[PDB]
Amino acid sequence: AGIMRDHIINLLKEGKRIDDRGFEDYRPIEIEVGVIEKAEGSALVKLGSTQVLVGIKTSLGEPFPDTPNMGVMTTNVELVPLASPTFEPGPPDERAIELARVIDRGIRESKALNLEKMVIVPGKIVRVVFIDVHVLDHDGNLMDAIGIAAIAALLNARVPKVRYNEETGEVETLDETEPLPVEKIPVPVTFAKIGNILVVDPSLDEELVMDGKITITTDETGHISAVQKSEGGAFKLEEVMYAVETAFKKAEEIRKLILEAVEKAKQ
Amino acid sequence: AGIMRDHIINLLKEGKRIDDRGFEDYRPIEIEVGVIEKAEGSALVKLGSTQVLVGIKTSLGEPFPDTPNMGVMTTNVELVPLASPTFEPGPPDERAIELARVIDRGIRESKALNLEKMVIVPGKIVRVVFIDVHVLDHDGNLMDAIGIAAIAALLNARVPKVRYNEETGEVETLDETEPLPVEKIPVPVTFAKIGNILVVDPSLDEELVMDGKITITTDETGHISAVQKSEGGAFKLEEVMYAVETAFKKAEEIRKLILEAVEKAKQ
Amino acid sequence: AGIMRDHIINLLKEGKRIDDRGFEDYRPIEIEVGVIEKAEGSALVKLGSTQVLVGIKTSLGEPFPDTPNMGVMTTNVELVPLASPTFEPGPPDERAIELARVIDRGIRESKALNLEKMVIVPGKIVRVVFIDVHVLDHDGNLMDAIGIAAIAALLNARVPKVRYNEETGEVETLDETEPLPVEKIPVPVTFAKIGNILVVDPSLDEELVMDGKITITTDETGHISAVQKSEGGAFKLEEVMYAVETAFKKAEEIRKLILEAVEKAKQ
Amino acid sequence: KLIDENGRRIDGRKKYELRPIKMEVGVLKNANGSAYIEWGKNKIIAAVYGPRELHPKHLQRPDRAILRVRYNMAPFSVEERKKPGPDRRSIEISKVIKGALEPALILEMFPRTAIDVFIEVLQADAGTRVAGITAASLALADAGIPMRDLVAACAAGKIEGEIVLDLNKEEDNYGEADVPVAIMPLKNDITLLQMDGYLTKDEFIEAVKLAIKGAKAVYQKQREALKEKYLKIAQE
Amino acid sequence: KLIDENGRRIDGRKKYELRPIKMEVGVLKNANGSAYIEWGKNKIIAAVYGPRELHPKHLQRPDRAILRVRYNMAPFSVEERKKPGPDRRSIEISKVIKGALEPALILEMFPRTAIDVFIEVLQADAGTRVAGITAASLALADAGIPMRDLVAACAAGKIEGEIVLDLNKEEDNYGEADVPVAIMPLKNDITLLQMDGYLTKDEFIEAVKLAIKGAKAVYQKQREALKEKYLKIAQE
Amino acid sequence: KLIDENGRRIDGRKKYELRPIKMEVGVLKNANGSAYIEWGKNKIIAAVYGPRELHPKHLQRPDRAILRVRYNMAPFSVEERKKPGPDRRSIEISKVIKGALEPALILEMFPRTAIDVFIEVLQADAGTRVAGITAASLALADAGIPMRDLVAACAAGKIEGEIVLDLNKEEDNYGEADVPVAIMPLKNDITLLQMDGYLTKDEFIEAVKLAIKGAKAVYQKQREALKEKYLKIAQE
Ligand SMILES: O=c1ccn([C@@H]2O[C@H](COP(=O)(O)OP(=O)(O)O)[C@@H](O)[C@H]2O)c(=O)[nH]1
Ligand SMILES: O=c1ccn([C@@H]2O[C@H](COP(=O)(O)OP(=O)(O)O)[C@@H](O)[C@H]2O)c(=O)[nH]1
Ligand SMILES: O=c1ccn([C@@H]2O[C@H](COP(=O)(O)OP(=O)(O)O)[C@@H](O)[C@H]2O)c(=O)[nH]1
Ligand SMILES: Nc1nc2c(ncn2[C@@H]2O[C@H](COP(=O)(O)O)[C@@H](O)[C@H]2O)c(=O)[nH]1
């Protein structure tokens, strides 16, 4: 390291990146959905050598008093020490907490998981959705890997049909399953600023030398549902503009791979 | 430091203290009540350069099973790292815990906040009072600063009138507010023993060299509702006697400034 | 230490142990039951200089949803810093957690405490039994000391007779007390492997040099209800066989001392 | 129902007006630098220590100071009393405030040290993180820490279909988006940029441009808080 | 209803009588020093280590040992099973026991070291902190730690309008005040003084004087526990 | 009701049959060594770092590496979502997996270092600890760590009165005993041996012998996973 900033900067001055990606290329992406078959939904996403598994476990529970009208969604990112010498055992650190929150905001604010279509008894019994993100190998850009795997696990999800028995007051969990009300596909696209250049899907080596990072999560509707400039550095307004544009373009390319992976797991 | 013990001791041998206070003088005191206007009550107290803010937030809740007959009061002191290079982030330390407890005992044992006049439904629904103490600048004698601010915030407090609807069983929180049943004004007066001399309202510099400390909390009725010898050192019985006497005298001077500040915030 | 491994190994080659015990001897055992008279049951066990106190506190509570049909038992081992320079303050460490679990498994899996005879209202109100183990002096073989004291405290236990009032729905805790449904006496017997020799009831000095450890808990019925090879090292199958046999023999000698101590505390 | 009418907001502000903002520097004795801010109903105090001895060492960086930030809300700052101690929100805000302040700081000036930024929210009313960043810069300047620029921050947001400056609690609660931005205004360097909500691209960009004008407005307040300190020192 | 009558208390003690107290020193193999105390229904064990290697260093004091105290109650010691681990009460008691023992210790004798005092309450029945202090001094003496005095402690209290010595749980539960005091009796140096409750000045002073006589009584017990150890050693 | 009939178990296995087991080594880029295992419905990943710089020092051992193990289940691995973070069960499993792997390792080869074994259970279906041990050995071999043997593990158990190999969740849930065993097969060295349940001596010994044959079977799978890596490397 350090010797690498320079090699990376200099390559970037020549339009090159160390793995010969263009500035707007993602590494090879692998999405495999429904890999944890005991969970309601799952997705293993590989962004190059970055690997994240996301598991979706749902139960029935009480909605928050504020919102009797809405199911629950909660997102946690575990940065397991096995994923990286930088990941230590213990409660989430600020990296895990920012990843969980930004991915959550992505999905929550696009209403990609419609929490309203997850009420069973208003004010009393709602669908509760745990998005548990298990990072298995950190090789850069955990943000996108996680968002891609979160959304794809949500799309994959098959939860037990539940019905309110209006003669008994009983809630009957049925064998038959059903998708989660997933209505959008937010995808984080994340850029590393290195010098005066932004490069999409930073690898770990690019993350080590980057000035700063910005992530833009957008859905099919042409909406942004999360932005997060993360780490240090500074972006220019025009950097940000470009990133939003490019992000929409990359998101779309990603959403195609997600939906394709989602559909493959139904064959 | 160390070079200061000696200067301080020697000044004390000559009836002097480094800021020219007499042994029985407090630093200039500032009390400003109702400064957190979203809280039910608040008080910013300055004891010289020591600054503590106390906020009083009340809710309605269940009383402790032991005591269906009594509201709840709970006191927490945060020693925020910003107040002092000695304050570190994390759960209360033993200093914060002793300050919270002694201040609480002060008020609880004088029944300065009458918990019995805070029942709404016996055994079921009581007024719950959080005394949250936020130390913003530690320059000595946090004990007195906190007690003064705790009590003054309690006096300042205006909580929502609550009424039991005996036809509906509903508890209606009304717009109209009302004081807390604050019926006494306990004030901690605290002395640093340095050598064979006790000096009231120790500054940080006096706390660094002190042998030990003793705090005496008394109310208007001529009662003691807390004593705490804190830190190391040893007091003589006659030291203790003097301290109780002097404390009553200082408390009274303080209670006048508290009540004056309380009344000012109603103009 | 280190100089001791060698002395210990060499003594062992000559059929000797440093305190002149034979390979199958326990140190002098002291069991004293009912020593914490405010607890429902207690036992102070000394295995030589190892000392463990176990206290049994019961309350009434809800059974686990999984098991409406069964009282509750929960076992905790505190390794108090006072017992040993190796015991540090904080939540259980892996040693405390393994001791608590293996002792618990011992008793739970032999149904030595019959949790079914501890239901008061099925699904709603069961007897809850805390086995709290307070290690006061670690001089080796905490496993056996704790199991012996756990079981003996259970045998000692006299809990309040509780009755369901079928006319009121009230649960009446009566003054009169009664044993816990303790129906077996599991006893851990634990061996330290040193070189190619197993030695029963390892002292701290033998624990410092041991290769590994194995504990075998058996009851009067000739059943094993826990096995735990603990620490490193490796055992041969025939080592394990011997240990099971010997354990049964030692357990029986111990159970006699336990029951004798239990009966003494009723005189 | 109804956060804009007509076209006055609930407290009387036009769409592009800021809440009353007052700022004071030098409010703490112990802190190396400190600032206090009333931005609305926000009341936030920021303290800096020092550059100082990092512990523990293994944290030291051989060529530069580190910046550590801690954003915290007092239990009594929010309408529902908040259990003391950080939570996920306050920890991401610390993280993002850090990432906000760090590019202003010349950290290679103080190798092996920490610069510790504390932000205490005494009263909270939306925009605490931009308010905090703003007081933090002033507390950094107050500490005598070389900076390339102040960092000023401000959020813009979408309420009732409309892009507005400097959301209040109510408007953020009922709003469609909140977009805090922090910049180093001399070079227009954006050091914080978050978007919570749902926005089109052009809604998002307008929000950014707007919150930046709010940020340049805040920045003038900042400088004025420093001017006033450099006049206050000038005795004798 | 009725803690004094006539003028016998519930267990038969007169106002100024102490509960049965037994003390043994040297009860632990691992500890450097240790003592055990039955004071009423109290059953408390105290252990000391050493002076020893402070970790971590940055704690060391260059001129003196530090005293660390930990007071803890076993889950089974109280009538309602107490969740293991400290709580605010046990942490203030540790703090105040520390502040109680420290002036007896000549800490500059063992620079850079810690002396660690552990107090485990095995059974609790009011007065655990004075009982603990008392066993702690004996465990300190047992450890061979130079002390200027033993520290003896004892509480007095107000029950049914009346100042009494050595409250029991019941009487402290229904009492009007509890006043533990610890002293180094040779010089009458008060090293702990707490008052929980409500008292006039003269009620408070009488309580202090009284708990001190209880403390001097306890102190004679202490010395006797040391005598008995210095006779027990004297073989051969 | 009915875990054996006839004499087929619920998934169709005879009493002494193992669940389908697949193993891959070299599945992680960051880890020094890694292995993945599907053993039933188990899906477990094991990673090793390095030997590496122990922090903190005071942990270092002057003559040997230390082995640290961490066994953890992902929230989504179990049927009832498990709150992240360890629990007593996972901490005893870490402890016992450590005690399982350590005798295979030649730790005096890497003094003052740590070897860190991480075991993540991605899906759990009984036997995770034996499955984990098995992937752990392979990840240790994968890391280039000198070992005296692989460690292979496997549990046997008692269901419906009968001693069977390689319990599944169901059968362990309704079973009468579970007996995991780990061995270093070359020397038949038993490095893990646990028994949860209730068993006679001869029931317990048969369980051990049987789980060992399961363990030797697993061991052949292990070697084959290494063979396949030493063929995969052999390009070019
Ligand atoms: O525990 C909390 C945290 C947040 N807030 C409120 O929510 C507002 C806005 O939320 P946001 O996450 O956007 O942070 P901010 O706008 O304050 O920077 C804060 O100012 C607080 O008024 C609250 O009431 N309780
Ligand atoms: O968690 C607790 C803590 C306190 N106590 C009881 O309260 C008594 C007296 O309270 P105090 O705070 O005065 O401490 P002590 O008198 O024991 O020093 C203790 O001895 C215990 O009997 C209890 O039952 N449970
Ligand atoms: O929090 C937990 C822990 C355990 N298990 C299940 O219980 C099984 C067997 O329990 P055991 O303690 O014997 O561990 P294992 O057999 O997995 O090594 C595990 O594989 C899991 O399937 C669970 O469902 N939730
Ligand atoms: N309303 C409601 N919230 C829950 C429930 N379970 C978890 N949560 C929320 O989701 C988060 C998940 O926490 P965990 O259960 O993973 O510890 C918590 O912060 C908690 O507030 C539930 O059953 N009902």
Ligand SMILES: Nc1nc2c(ncn2[C@@H]2O[C@H](COP(=O)(O)O)[C@@H](O)[C@H]2O)c(=O)[nH]1
């Ligand atoms: N009975 C009762 N006690 C409370 C309630 N809220 C807080 N407390 C008590 O007051 C203290 C405050 O804790 P916090 O709520 O600040 O974490 C706690 O130790 C708790 O026992 C309540 O609603 N009802």
Ligand SMILES: Nc1nc2c(ncn2[C@@H]2O[C@H](COP(=O)(O)O)[C@@H](O)[C@H]2O)c(=O)[nH]1
């Ligand atoms: N069902 C039930 N479980 C309890 C009860 N009290 C404690 N437990 C269980 O026993 C253990 C003891 O925890 P503690 O109460 O000592 O913190 C806990 O892990 C908890 O799950 C109770 O009243 N009901």
